[PDB]
């Protein structure tokens, strides 16, 4: 029988809080693991997300000077690399975000502002999320053009590394492409495909999502470019991915879905999509075979 799935955007209220691992529950190896002040700050962010209901404005947060410095450090360096590394759609949308959502080195954009911007451009919206969700629940958000988004900032001891998504990853990695209609469509259809799907199918969709939305490369005017959010927010892997020393294969869902998703190291392999339109077409054919 078909498992429960959200049927309208407010139904995400019921699965968004089905958190498998709370945001405040840091793994032994976390840079802030021994920091009780950062631990409290994380509990504050997790509580904001848990209390959030669809329809609410996303609570605005006053970021500390230390958090803003961490953002600025990350921001400053990544921006040096984007012109020579990022896909054209990313480069087109990022200056719009600087203009309308206050992206700059000395300011962390508010999720509410970014959500209102996306709603206008592609109908995407943001939902703050406490911590890790099941792949079923995370992907179901995309069905309604909702991106579940972390609001906290990585620990300041190491601005260039995070074991997990933080809101620097969300704002710099994900948001510029959610503002692109072809990418938004591609993403939504991953979500739509997942709704009520078997566990098996959900896992394969989540792996395809990982190797496009999070670590994807594309070919544009004969060049390899980056569109994966996990690359776009990581100084070291962004450079590595286009370095010439990375393994690279064509995006092909039946093959890609067999690949392991690595969380604490560089990927072993990156997949190249011809275009967002082509990736979308390939997923449509793939979904027929698993659903
Ligand atoms: C498939 N899936 C699920 O099943 N459940 C989710 O809740 C989920 C999800 N996918 C995402 S989105 C997402 N998962 C990620 C994993 C890794 C990375 N890696 C990096 O950013 C590298 C950066 C670093 N090396 C550096 O130093 O910069 C980016 C990710 N983006 N989430 C939301 C979620 C919210 C909170 C916590 C986890 C996940
Ligand atoms: Fe991500």
């Amino acid at each position: 029988s078909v498992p429960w799935f959200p049927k309208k955007i407010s139904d995400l209220d019921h699965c968004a809080n089905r958190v498998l691992m709370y945001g405040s529950e840091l793994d032994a190896d976390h840079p802030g693991f021994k920091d009780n002040v950062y631990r409290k700050r994380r509990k504050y962010f997790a509580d904001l997300a848990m209390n959030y209901k669809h329809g609410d404005p996303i609570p605005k947060v006053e970021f500390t000077e230390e958090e803003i410095k961490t953002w600025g450090t990350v921001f400053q360096e990544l921006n040096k690399l984007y012109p020579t590394h990022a896909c054209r759609e990313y480069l087109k949308n990022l200056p719009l975000l600087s203009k309308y959502c206050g992206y700059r080195e000395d300011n962390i954009p508010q999720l509410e502002d970014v959500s209102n911007f996306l709603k206008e451009r592609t109908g995407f919206s943001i939902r703050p999320v406490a911590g890790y969700l099941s792949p079923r629940d995370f992907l179901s958000g995309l069905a309604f053009r909702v991106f579940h988004c972390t609001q906290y900032v990585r620990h300041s001891s190491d601005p260039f590394y995070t074991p997990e998504p933080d809101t620097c990853h969300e704002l710099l990695g994900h948001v510029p492409l959610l503002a692109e209609p072809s990418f938004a469509q591609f993403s939504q259809e991953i979500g739509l495909a997942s709704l009520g799907a078997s566990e098996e199918a959900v896992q394969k969709l989540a792996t395809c999502y990982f190797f496009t939305v999070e670590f994807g490369l594309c070919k544009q005017d004969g060049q390899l470019r980056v569109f994966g959010a996990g690359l776009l927010s990581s100084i070291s892997e962004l450079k590595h991915a286009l370095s010439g020393h990375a393994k690279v294969k064509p995006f092909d869902p039946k093959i890609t879905c067999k690949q392991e998703c690595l969380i604490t190291t560089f990927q072993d392999v990156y997949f190249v999509s011809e275009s967002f339109e082509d990736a979308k077409e390939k997923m449509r054919e793939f979904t027929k075979t698993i659903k």
Side-chain angles (χ1 to χ4, degrees):
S1 66
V2 181
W4 178 86
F5 57 94
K7 292 149 185 67
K8 60 194 182 312
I9 185 167
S10 71
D11 283 346
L12 295 174
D13 288 344
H14 310 309
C15 61
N17 278 2
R18 303 200 283 201
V19 182
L20 272 39
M21 210 197 264
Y22 286 139
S24 45
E25 314 189 288
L26 320 174
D27 285 335
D29 308 274
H30 197 277
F33 180 89
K34 288 169 273 183
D35 185 341
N36 72 280
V37 170
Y38 181 82
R39 287 185 85 100
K40 290 184 193 150
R41 183 65 157 170
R42 296 287 300 259
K43 179 56 161 55
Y44 164 78
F45 280 111
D47 282 349
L48 286 186
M50 281 292 302
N51 287 316
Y52 173 92
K53 298 296 169 171
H54 171 72
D56 293 351
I58 301 177
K60 285 197 172 171
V61 169
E62 179 172 0
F63 292 100
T64 67
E65 255 183 1
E66 176 180 349
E67 284 164 348
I68 295 177
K69 187 184 189 300
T70 299
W71 159 268
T73 298
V74 170
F75 182 92
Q76 208 176 302
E77 292 302 312
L78 289 167
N79 268 284
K80 289 176 191 165
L81 297 173
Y82 288 147
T84 59
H85 288 68
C87 66
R88 76 173 56 101
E89 300 90 333
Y90 185 96
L91 293 176
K92 179 188 174 190
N93 290 318
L94 188 48
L96 301 185
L97 288 158
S98 283
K99 191 180 167 73
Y100 295 109
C101 298
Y103 282 54
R104 33 180 195 275
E105 275 176 25
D106 68 337
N107 185 66
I108 299 180
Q110 298 288 332
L111 295 185
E112 175 71 359
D113 297 340
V114 173
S115 192
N116 287 335
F117 173 87
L118 293 176
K119 285 178 186 171
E120 222 80 65
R121 300 280 301 189
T122 59
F124 251 84
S125 68
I126 292 163
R127 178 173 186 125
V129 63
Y132 178 82
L133 294 172
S134 71
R136 178 178 305 280
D137 289 341
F138 180 80
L139 296 174
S140 70
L142 299 178
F144 300 92
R145 295 192 177 219
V146 174
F147 190 79
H148 288 87
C149 184
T150 56
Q151 197 172 20
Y152 56 84
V153 185
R154 63 193 64 188
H155 190 261
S156 62
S157 62
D158 189 5
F160 302 123
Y161 181 75
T162 177
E164 65 194 344
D166 76 330
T167 198
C168 303
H169 166 72
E170 315 295 15
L171 294 170
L172 292 173
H174 282 284
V175 169
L177 282 151
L178 294 177
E180 182 73 13
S182 58
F183 188 86
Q185 184 72 30
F186 167 75
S187 300
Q188 183 178 26
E189 289 191 18
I190 298 185
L192 288 170
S194 74
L195 294 180
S198 70
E199 296 297 332
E200 290 70 27
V202 166
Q203 204 65 251
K204 290 179 189 149
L205 294 167
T207 302
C208 290
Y209 167 95
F210 188 80
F211 284 107
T212 53
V213 177
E214 299 286 343
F215 285 89
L217 300 178
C218 58
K219 206 180 204 63
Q220 293 188 330
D221 301 333
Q223 306 179 20
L224 289 173
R225 312 296 285 175
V226 176
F227 74 94
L231 297 172
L232 289 165
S233 61
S234 169
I235 290 158
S236 58
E237 204 169 350
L238 182 59
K239 297 190 277 209
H240 174 75
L242 298 189
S243 69
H245 304 311
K247 297 180 177 172
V248 159
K249 296 182 176 297
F251 176 61
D252 183 12
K254 58 184 168 287
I255 303 308
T256 302
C257 74
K258 306 183 187 179
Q259 190 68 35
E260 182 180 2
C261 302
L262 308 181
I263 307 292
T264 66
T265 64
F266 290 175
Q267 302 309 311
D268 290 323
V269 62
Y270 304 96
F271 293 88
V272 181
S273 299
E274 295 301 320
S275 65
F276 302 150
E277 295 78 3
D278 192 57
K280 184 190 54 179
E281 289 292 354
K282 294 197 181 324
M283 287 303 286
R284 287 172 179 180
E285 299 312 289
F286 181 65
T287 287
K288 294 174 186 302
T289 72
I290 60 178
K291 199 180 186 179

